[PDB]
């Protein structure tokens, strides 16, 4: 790793003097998540639709 980054991060930390006690601490499948969402939402919506269909 480039040694030059030692000085790069040092100046960043120097800036913290102004940002006291507020410094940013840091610096599931997509397909599955969509798949589950329709299953749970679908059951509620479809049950409502089915009830109307059964009466009709």
């Amino acid at each position: 790793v480039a040694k030059q980054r030692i000085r790069m991060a040092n100046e960043k930390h120097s800036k913290n003097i102004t940002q006291r006690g507020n410094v940013a601490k840091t610096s599931v499948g997509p397909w599955l998540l969509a798949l589950f969402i329709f299953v749970v939402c679908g059951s509620a919506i479809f049950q409502i639709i089915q009830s109307i269909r059964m009466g009709m």
């Binding site: 599931v28 969402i37 299953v39 939402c41 059951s43 509620a44 479809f46 409502i48 009830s51 109307i52």
Partner: protein
């Protein structure tokens, strides 16, 4: 984002009442009694009919009440509340909804989900009145429709309080779980001993299987012919259907015990030994719920799509509707109607069985991550408890759980599916999923009894 919502909803959340904390632990005689009063009041309410039911043929809703539960005050029942709970859990697993670890944030989260269930009840009731299922909205009148909606809404609200009280510790266990178990057991007893006689075109017969046997035996001179009818009468509940049910209970009890226990110790104090148990049915009934929901959802879309575009080849290819899909993938998903049909088309039967087992197993493993019961979550929970495994470092413990947790969830999904398929072919009364709930809830109550006897 969701936390920002929580503050916005915070004024709304406050209105909802909360049950008082029990000041002191309750002795056993008292402990049982609080649940019983709750059970009776709920049971009576379930059967009360509604007001302004209207109905061509007058007294239609009269005949309806004496058969099924359709039209009663508790028709909405538990379905609105459970849907609210499941959706909230899924969002947390997604992380789209953020819940603060601090107790105050979690308490707000509980308030929000209770409120969300209340919203579901209002929407469901309004749809039924608009649909005119009870009767034409114009015929009912504005006053009648408003009153009927009020009746259902209070019915939902009262249920929430009763369930909360059981959780609060006045009564053992959780109210909703007991209520679901109660009807399931009630169904088994009712079919067995119900004295109502229903008139078939050939002749009137008793609903109760045991009652039917006694009556049939005396009436008919030929004992052998009567005996065969009672055991294998298709139209009405069979004697065999009960015997299948008893057999299914025996299997559920034996398997339910299965669990793996891992030694654990408290860091603070020496000599204290506790075991953390992971059950074989670790996922519980959730996988079957998801798989059935998907199949029903697909069926509704497929049948509806056929009507709108009958011509389209794609809709026919997935399913052909006669509503039962005669052919196509949806037809394969459908359970085989009879044992004789299965022999007729073995390939259809094999495809359904293989799919049923696979779907449950896959869903269970995926569910764990969104559920929040994964090994990573379990380890962090122990740290707050200040209890750690004995002989291992904290980081190593996570690996140790990962050895057992994933395998158990996959097997549990397969096992639950296997029972559900088994129940229908035997023909035992009630769903297999219902059977597990009854045994599990009863056994938990039994465990509480053991300490009391001391």
């Amino acid at each position: 984002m969701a936390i920002k919502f929580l503050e916005v909803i915070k004024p709304f959340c406050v209105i909802l009442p909360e049950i008082q904390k029990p000041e002191r632990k309750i002795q056993f005689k008292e402990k049982v009694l609080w649940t019983a009063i709750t059970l009776f009041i709920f049971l009576v309410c379930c059967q009360i009919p509604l007001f302004g039911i209207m109905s061509a043929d007058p007294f239609y809703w009269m005949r309806v009440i004496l058969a099924s539960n359709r039209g009663t005050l508790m028709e909405l029942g538990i379905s609105p509340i459970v849907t609210s709970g499941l959706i909230m859990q899924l969002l947390a697993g997604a992380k789209i909804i953020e819940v603060g670890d601090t107790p105050k944030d979690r308490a707000l989260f509980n308030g929000a989900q209770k409120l969300f269930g209340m919203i579901i009840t209002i929407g469901q009731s309004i749809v039924y009145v608009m649909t005119g299922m009870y009767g034409d909205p114009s015929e009912m009148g504005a006053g009648i429709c408003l009153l009927i909606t009020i009746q259902l809404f209070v019915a939902g609200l009262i249920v929430l309080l009763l369930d909360e009280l059981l959780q609060k510790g006045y009564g053992l266990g959780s109210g909703i779980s007991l209520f679901i178990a109660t009807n399931i057991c009630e169904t088994i007893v009712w079919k067995a001993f119900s004295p109502t006689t229903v008139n078939t075109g050939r002749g009137m017969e008793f609903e109760g299987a045991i009652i039917a046997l006694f009556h049939l035996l005396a009436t008919r001179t030929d004992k052998v012919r009567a005996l065969r009818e009672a055991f294998y009468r298709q139209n009405l509940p069979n004697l065999m259907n009960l015997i299948a049910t008893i057999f299914v209970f025996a299997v559920v009890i034996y398997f339910q015990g299965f669990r793996v226990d891992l030694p654990i110790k408290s860091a603070r104090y020496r000599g204290q030994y506790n075991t953390y148990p992971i059950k074989l049915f670790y996922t519980s009934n959730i996988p079957i719920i998801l798989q059935s929901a998907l199949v029903s959802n697909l069926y509704v879309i497929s049948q509806m799509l056929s009507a709108r575009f009958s011509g389209n080849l794609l809709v026919s290819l997935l399913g052909t509707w006669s509503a039962y899909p005669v052919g196509g993938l949806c037809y394969y998903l459908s359970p085989p109607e009879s044992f004789g049909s299965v022999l007729e088309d073995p390939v259809h039967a094999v495809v359904y069985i293989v799919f049923m087992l696979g779907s449950c197993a896959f869903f269970s493993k995926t569910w764990i991550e969104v559920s929040g019961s994964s090994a990573k979550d379990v380890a962090k929970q122990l740290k707050e408890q200040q209890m750690v495994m004995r002989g291992h470092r904290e980081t190593s413990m996570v690996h140790e759980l990962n050895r057992y947790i994933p395998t158990a969830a996959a097997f549990g999904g397969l096992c639950i599916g296997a029972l559900s398929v088994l129940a229908d072919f035997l023909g035992a009364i009630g769903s297999g999923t219902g059977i597990l709930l009854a045994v599990t809830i009863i056994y938990q109550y039994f465990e509480i009894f053991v300490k009391e006897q001391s």
